Amino acid sequence: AFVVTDNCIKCKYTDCVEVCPVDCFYEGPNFLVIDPDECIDCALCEPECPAQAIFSEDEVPEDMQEFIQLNAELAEVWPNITEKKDPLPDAEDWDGVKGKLQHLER
Ligand code: SF4
Ligand code: F3S
Numbered sequence: 001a002f003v004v005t006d007n008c009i010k011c012k013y014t015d016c017v018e019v020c021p022v023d024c025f026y027e028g029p030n031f032l033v034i035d036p037d038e039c040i041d042c043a044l045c046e047p048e049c050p051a052q053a054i055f056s057e058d059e060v061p062e063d064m065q066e067f068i069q070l071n072a073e074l075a076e077v078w079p080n081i082t083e084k085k086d087p088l089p090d091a092e093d094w095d096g097v098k099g100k101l102q103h104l105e106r
Contacts, residue, residue, distance in 0.1 A: 001034060001037075001039040001068075002039055002043065003036075003054065003056075003067050004053050004071060005064040006099070008049070008051055008053035008054075010090070011053070011091040012030055012031060013051060014032065014081065014085050017045075019045050020044070022040055025045075025081050026079060029106075030103065030104065030105050031105075033078065036057070036071060074106075
């Protein structure tokens with residue numbers, strides 16, 4: 001599975017959904033997650049994230065380990081997203097800010 005980690009929060013560019021062959025991205029107010037059961041690990045989405053927020057599960061930084069189980073849980077409750085949309089309004093003011101998990105919205 002590939003995993004979306006911290007820098008997606010309040011950026012949510014959605015460039016990643018274009019390239020997904022299986023449509024396994026699920027949409028929240030200010031973040032996207034990958035459903036781990038659906039993901040086929042094609043790795044096509046991770047060059048496409050402008051925030052460089054996507055990682056192979058086995059490469060998730062030590063300090064972002066929580067995001068693996070978070071993707072799995074929120075994928076069960078959030079709606080599937082299959083079309084790119086516009087980035088959140090202030091997405092590049094927040095791109096690269098560390099510690100954005102405290103801003104996640106359900
Ligand atoms: S690795 Fe492939 S299947 Fe998995 S979320 Fe990314 S593009 Fe979709
Ligand atoms: S910022 Fe998030 S919405 Fe997709 S393109 Fe990157 S994982």
